[PDB]
């Protein structure tokens, strides 16, 4: 249960199921209808974002390490600076997110704790 919970990915409603049996762990949002799924590497996840407790809003997200270290042009003085990739998931229950947001973090802390 703790390693699973449904969420919204890109306006679609699917299921977010965490895999703590890996290393680094992994998140997997699969559509409810089975149209598509998004996998997440809690390790690659630059950080974990989730709606605050004071906010009835039930949503969890995982940021991704970006390559902003470059931040340069192409030739016409333009601007590239690769944008960051974060996985946003909207939960329809603070209980799911509460059970999920804890899971991810429960593992994450192990990456630093193990760092």
């Amino acid at each position: 249960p703790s390693h699973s919970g449904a969420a919204i990915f890109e306006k679609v409603s699917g299921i977010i199921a965490i895999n703590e049996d890996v290393s680094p762990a992994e998140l997997t949002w699969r559509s409810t209808d089975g149209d598509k799924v998004h996998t997440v590497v809690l390790s690659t996840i630059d950080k974990l974002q989730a709606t605050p407790a004071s906010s009835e809003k039930m949503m969890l997200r995982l940021i991704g390490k970006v390559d902003e270290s470059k931040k340069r042009k192409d030739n016409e003085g333009n601007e590239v600076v690769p944008k960051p990739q974060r996985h946003m998931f909207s939960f329809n229950n603070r209980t799911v997110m509460d059970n999920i947001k804890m899971t991810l973090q429960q593992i994450i802390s192990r990456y630093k704790d193990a760092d």
């Binding site: 974002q49 989730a50 709606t51 605050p52 906010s55 809003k57």
Partner: peptide, 20 residues
């Protein structure tokens, strides 16, 4: 279901270590 969310009140959860 046209628009009833809020991506402005989002916060970051506590995570050990800070390599920001």
């Amino acid at each position: 279901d046209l628009e009833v969310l809020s991506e402005e009140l989002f916060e970051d959860v506590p995570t050990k270590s800070q390599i920001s």
